[PDB]
Design an enzyme around this catalytic site. Structure first.
Site, PDB file in Angstrom:
ATOM      1  N   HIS A  36     -15.603   6.736   1.009  1.00  0.00           N
ATOM      2  CA  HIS A  36     -15.310   5.314   0.888  1.00  0.00           C
ATOM      3  C   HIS A  36     -14.174   5.118  -0.116  1.00  0.00           C
ATOM      4  O   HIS A  36     -14.360   5.308  -1.325  1.00  0.00           O
ATOM      5  CB  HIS A  36     -16.580   4.562   0.481  1.00  0.00           C
ATOM      6  CG  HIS A  36     -16.369   3.110   0.198  1.00  0.00           C
ATOM      7  ND1 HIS A  36     -15.702   2.656  -0.924  1.00  0.00           N
ATOM      8  CD2 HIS A  36     -16.703   2.009   0.917  1.00  0.00           C
ATOM      9  CE1 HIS A  36     -15.657   1.334  -0.891  1.00  0.00           C
ATOM     10  NE2 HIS A  36     -16.262   0.919   0.211  1.00  0.00           N
ATOM     11  N   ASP A  37     -12.990   4.783   0.407  1.00  0.00           N
ATOM     12  CA  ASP A  37     -11.864   4.262  -0.374  1.00  0.00           C
ATOM     13  C   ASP A  37     -11.449   5.197  -1.509  1.00  0.00           C
ATOM     14  O   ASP A  37     -11.143   4.744  -2.615  1.00  0.00           O
ATOM     15  CB  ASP A  37     -12.170   2.871  -0.934  1.00  0.00           C
ATOM     16  CG  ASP A  37     -12.328   1.820   0.148  1.00  0.00           C
ATOM     17  OD1 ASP A  37     -12.260   2.186   1.342  1.00  0.00           O
ATOM     18  OD2 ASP A  37     -12.510   0.633  -0.203  1.00  0.00           O
ATOM     19  N   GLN A  79      -7.913   1.112   2.354  1.00  0.00           N
ATOM     20  CA  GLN A  79      -7.270  -0.190   2.433  1.00  0.00           C
ATOM     21  C   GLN A  79      -5.781  -0.031   2.739  1.00  0.00           C
ATOM     22  O   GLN A  79      -5.133   0.888   2.229  1.00  0.00           O
ATOM     23  CB  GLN A  79      -7.434  -0.952   1.126  1.00  0.00           C
ATOM     24  CG  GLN A  79      -8.809  -1.511   0.922  1.00  0.00           C
ATOM     25  CD  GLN A  79      -8.814  -2.587  -0.136  1.00  0.00           C
ATOM     26  OE1 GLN A  79      -7.785  -3.223  -0.398  1.00  0.00           O
ATOM     27  NE2 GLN A  79      -9.960  -2.779  -0.775  1.00  0.00           N
ATOM     28  N   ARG A  88      -6.355 -10.963   4.142  1.00  0.00           N
ATOM     29  CA  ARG A  88      -7.024 -10.630   2.888  1.00  0.00           C
ATOM     30  C   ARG A  88      -7.968 -11.735   2.422  1.00  0.00           C
ATOM     31  O   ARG A  88      -8.994 -11.437   1.793  1.00  0.00           O
ATOM     32  CB  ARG A  88      -5.991 -10.314   1.804  1.00  0.00           C
ATOM     33  CG  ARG A  88      -6.632  -9.987   0.452  1.00  0.00           C
ATOM     34  CD  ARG A  88      -5.756  -9.063  -0.366  1.00  0.00           C
ATOM     35  NE  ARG A  88      -6.241  -8.844  -1.725  1.00  0.00           N
ATOM     36  CZ  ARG A  88      -6.982  -7.811  -2.101  1.00  0.00           C
ATOM     37  NH1 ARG A  88      -7.361  -6.896  -1.214  1.00  0.00           N
ATOM     38  NH2 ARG A  88      -7.351  -7.698  -3.368  1.00  0.00           N
ATOM     39  N   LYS A 120      -9.626  -0.279   6.120  1.00  0.00           N
ATOM     40  CA  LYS A 120     -10.672  -1.102   5.518  1.00  0.00           C
ATOM     41  C   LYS A 120     -10.094  -2.435   5.060  1.00  0.00           C
ATOM     42  O   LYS A 120      -9.010  -2.470   4.471  1.00  0.00           O
ATOM     43  CB  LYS A 120     -11.295  -0.382   4.315  1.00  0.00           C
ATOM     44  CG  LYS A 120     -12.418  -1.155   3.609  1.00  0.00           C
ATOM     45  CD  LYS A 120     -13.109  -0.238   2.652  1.00  0.00           C
ATOM     46  CE  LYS A 120     -14.287  -0.826   1.894  1.00  0.00           C
ATOM     47  NZ  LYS A 120     -15.403  -0.976   2.817  1.00  0.00           N
ATOM     48  N   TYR A 149     -15.984   1.890  -5.255  1.00  0.00           N
ATOM     49  CA  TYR A 149     -16.681   1.824  -6.519  1.00  0.00           C
ATOM     50  C   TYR A 149     -18.125   1.466  -6.195  1.00  0.00           C
ATOM     51  O   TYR A 149     -18.359   0.672  -5.297  1.00  0.00           O
ATOM     52  CB  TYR A 149     -16.076   0.747  -7.430  1.00  0.00           C
ATOM     53  CG  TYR A 149     -14.631   0.957  -7.774  1.00  0.00           C
ATOM     54  CD1 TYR A 149     -13.652   0.202  -7.181  1.00  0.00           C
ATOM     55  CD2 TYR A 149     -14.243   1.905  -8.672  1.00  0.00           C
ATOM     56  CE1 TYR A 149     -12.340   0.386  -7.477  1.00  0.00           C
ATOM     57  CE2 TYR A 149     -12.936   2.105  -8.970  1.00  0.00           C
ATOM     58  CZ  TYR A 149     -11.984   1.340  -8.364  1.00  0.00           C
ATOM     59  OH  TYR A 149     -10.693   1.521  -8.640  1.00  0.00           O
ATOM     60  N   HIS A 151     -20.786  -0.496  -7.370  1.00  0.00           N
ATOM     61  CA  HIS A 151     -21.436  -1.799  -7.242  1.00  0.00           C
ATOM     62  C   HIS A 151     -20.694  -2.766  -6.332  1.00  0.00           C
ATOM     63  O   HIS A 151     -21.203  -3.868  -6.095  1.00  0.00           O
ATOM     64  CB  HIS A 151     -21.643  -2.438  -8.625  1.00  0.00           C
ATOM     65  CG  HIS A 151     -20.393  -2.996  -9.242  1.00  0.00           C
ATOM     66  ND1 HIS A 151     -19.393  -2.199  -9.758  1.00  0.00           N
ATOM     67  CD2 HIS A 151     -19.996  -4.277  -9.445  1.00  0.00           C
ATOM     68  CE1 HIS A 151     -18.428  -2.963 -10.241  1.00  0.00           C
ATOM     69  NE2 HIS A 151     -18.769  -4.229 -10.063  1.00  0.00           N
ATOM     70  N   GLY A 153     -17.883  -1.870  -3.132  1.00  0.00           N
ATOM     71  CA  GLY A 153     -17.817  -1.436  -1.739  1.00  0.00           C
ATOM     72  C   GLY A 153     -18.987  -0.564  -1.308  1.00  0.00           C
ATOM     73  O   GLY A 153     -19.468  -0.669  -0.175  1.00  0.00           O
TER      74      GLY A 153
END
Lengths: 208, 208
Positions: A36-37, A79, A88, A120, A149, A151, A153
């Site tokens: 994730h990201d 992203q 956005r 994303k 992060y 808390h 995504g």
């Protein structure tokens, strides 16, 4: 408004992980790994040479290697730069215009040719991506989550997955966050309300 | 696995509400009030004669009455009894089979004939309901949220709304939760990552 300059902190000891309320076990025939990201842009807010970034990257690599060895698909989210303000939307009010460069996956955990990569757009990896319908197509209903992060995504992705009937497993020593508190509180919330919290070694032994 | 017997606690003081990071203003022409899951089943887990339930119910009534006077639609959500296990899906792993009775909205805040009522299936009021497309039809992009429980359904609804380009406003003295801590942490999370936290009086003043 801006992502903080994240002060170094220690990866929480495995003995401090919160206890799981559900008893799901990761199944290599039913699981997908989501990276994730893990973009240069998001990891540059940390001092990469300091805890928890070296351990995070080594642990992500341990996860994706065991995953590919067991035939588990690895999906990366990233992203895009220079997002259309209409696309956005309300993110700009909290975080600004968004990244304009450094969109590449960080080189330590760069994707392999067989991996999938999705663009994303929101906290949750399910919004405006093919993730849900592709997991249904693959008939896999478990999502093993690593990255940043915690808390934001990670948490939001765990909550769509849960509500979309996908079992989320957050790998507690393969994510990082704004602080040790944010990281831990992410795991406490998931373990008690939205999914499962597992260690890198529990994933490896579950998928051999 | 079971909803706890929720111990009574004091409604948090208005001076302790977290500061908002965004500057959104509630607009009576663009807003909808959501009364989230104020069913006998969920509220009976509290001793309803003790804080915060009396204040919750009269604050919800203050909100909905000023809303209807301003032409703001009011939508209630309610879980149905005896949910099909295939439809209830992973909720059963955390919470059991779900309610089998006590499905009515509590009489103190009973819906009016003009109000909308949706059958709810997940933490978020947007999953498997017409809420998103109906708000688009009505050209209203603000959701004012009241009800229970803060860190579960309120939080998930606010996150979904935010990600779906709907501005969520959580009314801090018109929600309740498993504890004073969960209640506050819900408001802190929304205000810093997902929406706006307002008081009943701020809503009343905003919609006149």
């Amino acid at each position: 408004m801006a992502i903080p300059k994240i002060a170094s902190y220690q990866v929480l000891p495995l003995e401090s992980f919160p206890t799981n309320k559900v008893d799901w076990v990761i199944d290599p025939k039913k699981s997908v790994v989501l990276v994730h990201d893990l973009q240069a842009y998001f990891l540059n807010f940390f001092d990469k040479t300091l805890s928890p970034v070296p351990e995070l990257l080594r642990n992500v690599n341990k996860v994706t290697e065991s995953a590919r060895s067991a035939g588990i698909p690895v999906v990366y989210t990233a992203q895009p730069a220079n997002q259309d303000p209409n696309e956005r939307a309300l993110l700009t009010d909290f975080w600004g215009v968004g990244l304009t460069q450094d969109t590449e996956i960080v080189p330590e955990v760069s994707p392999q040719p067989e991996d999938i990569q999705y663009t994303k757009w929101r906290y949750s990896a399910f919004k405006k991506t093919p993730l849900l319908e592709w997991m249904k197509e693959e008939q896999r209903d478990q999502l093993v989550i690593v990255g940043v992060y915690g808390h934001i995504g990670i948490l939001s992705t765990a909550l769509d997955a849960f509500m979309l009937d996908i079992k989320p497993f957050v790998i507690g020593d393969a994510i990082a966050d704004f602080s040790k508190e944010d990281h831990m509180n992410t795991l406490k919330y998931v373990a008690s309300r939205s999914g499962s919290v597992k260690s890198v070694d529990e994933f490896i032994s579950s998928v051999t």
